[PDB]
Each structure stands twice: as structure tokens, then as C-alpha cells.
Amino acid sequence: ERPTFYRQELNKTIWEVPERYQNLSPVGSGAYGSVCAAFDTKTGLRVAVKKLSRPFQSIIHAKRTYRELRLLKHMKHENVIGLLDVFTPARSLEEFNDVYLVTHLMGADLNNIVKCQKLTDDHVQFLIYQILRGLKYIHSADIIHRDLKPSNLAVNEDCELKILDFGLARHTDDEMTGYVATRWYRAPEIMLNWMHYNQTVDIWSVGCIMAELLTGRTLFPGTDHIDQLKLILRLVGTPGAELLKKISSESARNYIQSLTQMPKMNFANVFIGANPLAVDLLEKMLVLDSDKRITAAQALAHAYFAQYHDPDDEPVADPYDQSFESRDLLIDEWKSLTYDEVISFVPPPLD
């Protein structure tokens, strides 16, 4: 590495980036840092360059920073966000304090394309197909997204989709109160912390997204946790003895049982006029018991994606080492590991 870095101040934010990145224009800011749009002269792509505020200000922040880089450094799939570059103007680990992440500039998210209508079956087939393809890859690496929602799905003009902003990072809390979309896509068990969730929590999310692409309406727009749980059970039915056994909190089990029992509803009478195939997949995705939900790899083989499925074009990931997740390190140690990951970044090829 080590090119020539030039520095400038845009929106009172200092940016020290290599010369390959030109014509930087602020495009977002916040506690996390700031994001810029720029032109990458070496790849010819319009990229987003994110400058992380002060990444090593606590053991938890330095950890989340290490986690983000590792995650992004690992993701190599067409339908998943990838890392184009990572740099720091620092010449040594001593002065290493700033981390910049560079990725393809994402324009519109799914929450724009759809919020503006109810789509055609072929569009739903395609968009959900890609979400599942990327999810098969992610899950195959033992990664659970945990926060799949329209706003976390970049979609271009050609209806090509990429899975973004991974949940794996920021502790699940704070912004899930009330009438908020940040919770309408969550599986009941992760939402009410009934049990230790598995990868199928992401599948429940795809179902919510898919159903919303078909009807043009939010499937479970609860005004709060309980109101949402209620909406869910009305459609999916209340838990039975088998699932109840798996809910660990005794008050949670006690609460569930205070509810009048309800049978699963007829989905064809909910998703009126939808491709029967779409209806069937939804029923296999929105299953209360996470253990009986369909897996991404299984969903891809569903007759609903007959027009796009090709087992030879749905790759899985290289093994992802998350041992660090259980490692007990000091800030400087998380900071050193991050630096190593930065220093060692090898760019994706141009072809």
C-alpha cells in the first residue's frame, strides 16, 4: 500500500485520503463518523468512503470496529456488501487512530423502490431471490444478519440487490420502542427474547419483506412489542406445547399462555390474488417455531424461483473465524488487531 494522501476539510471534518479518491462530497454524518461520495480513479467506481469517528474510544467501540472490518473483509458475494478498500493515513501503529472504509456507493434502498407501490410477481421473485442467495452465503459462514429490513437492502435501477448494514455489531436495543420499522421485521423469539435465536430469524425477516413487496403494506406494523406479537399470532397461530417447551423464560411462557389460542390463518385469504407459489413459500418462511422454518438454501430450491435458481450459481462462504468474539482484550489489543487487518487488506480483483 502507502500511496500519497491528501487532506481537506469538508463540513468541518478532516479527510486524509489517498489521491485515487477524487471529488469527495459529504453524503452523511453522525455519531459513527461521516460518509462521503467520491470517485475511485483506480477502479472507476463511485464509492462511499466512511471515516469512523474515534473507533477506539472504549473496549466496546474498538471491538465493534474490529468486528466490522473482519466482517466486511470477509464478505465476497454479489448480493452482499463488500469492502473495496480500507486505509489509515497513519504511518505507524503508534499514530494509528483513524479508520476509513471504502465500498460501492449505494444509491436507493428497497425501502424506496417499494414504499412507492405494490410490485409485480416477477419483481418479487427476483428481489427475494437475491436476498436468499446472499443469505445462503452469509449463513453458510455461520453469520446471522439479525436486522434484515427494507432500509438495509440496496437496490439499483436494474433491480439488483445487496444486503447491507449488518446487525452483527451493535447490541440489539434502544430503538425498538413504539410504532417503529426497526422492529416490524424481527422474529418474535428474538423480539421478546424468548430463546437463543438461530439463523432462521433472518428467514422470518425475508418473509415480512416478501409479504410487503406483494401487498405493498407492512405485514406486522405493531405499535409496540406486545401489539406486534399479537398481530403475529393472529396470522401464524399461538404456540403449541412443543414450541412452548423451547421458550426459556417462565414469565414469557406464562404470558403466552394467558393468550386465547388461535389457529394459523389461511394465507391465500391474506395474500389475495398472489401467485399460489408465493403464498406457499411465505407459509414456509413465517412459521412460529424457528426450528421448523425453511433455510435459505431450501428456499432457493422452491418452485417459486424456478426462473432464477441455478445451484451452480449460489456459492457459499469460506469459513468465518469468530473466535475473537469471545476474546477478552484491552483497547490497545483490539486496536492492534484492527491495525493488522487494515495494514493487510488485499483488494478485490478488477475483471
Ligand SMILES: C[S@](=O)c1ccc(-c2nc(-c3ccc(F)cc3)c(-c3ccncc3)[nH]2)cc1
Ligand atoms: C450507525 S449509523 O446509523 C450509520 C449509518 C450509515 C453508515 C454507512 N456506512 C457506509 C459504508 C461506507 C464504506 C464501507 F466500506 C462500508 C459501509 C454507508 C454507505 C454505503 C454505500 N453507499 C452509501 C453509504 N453508510 C454507517 C453507520
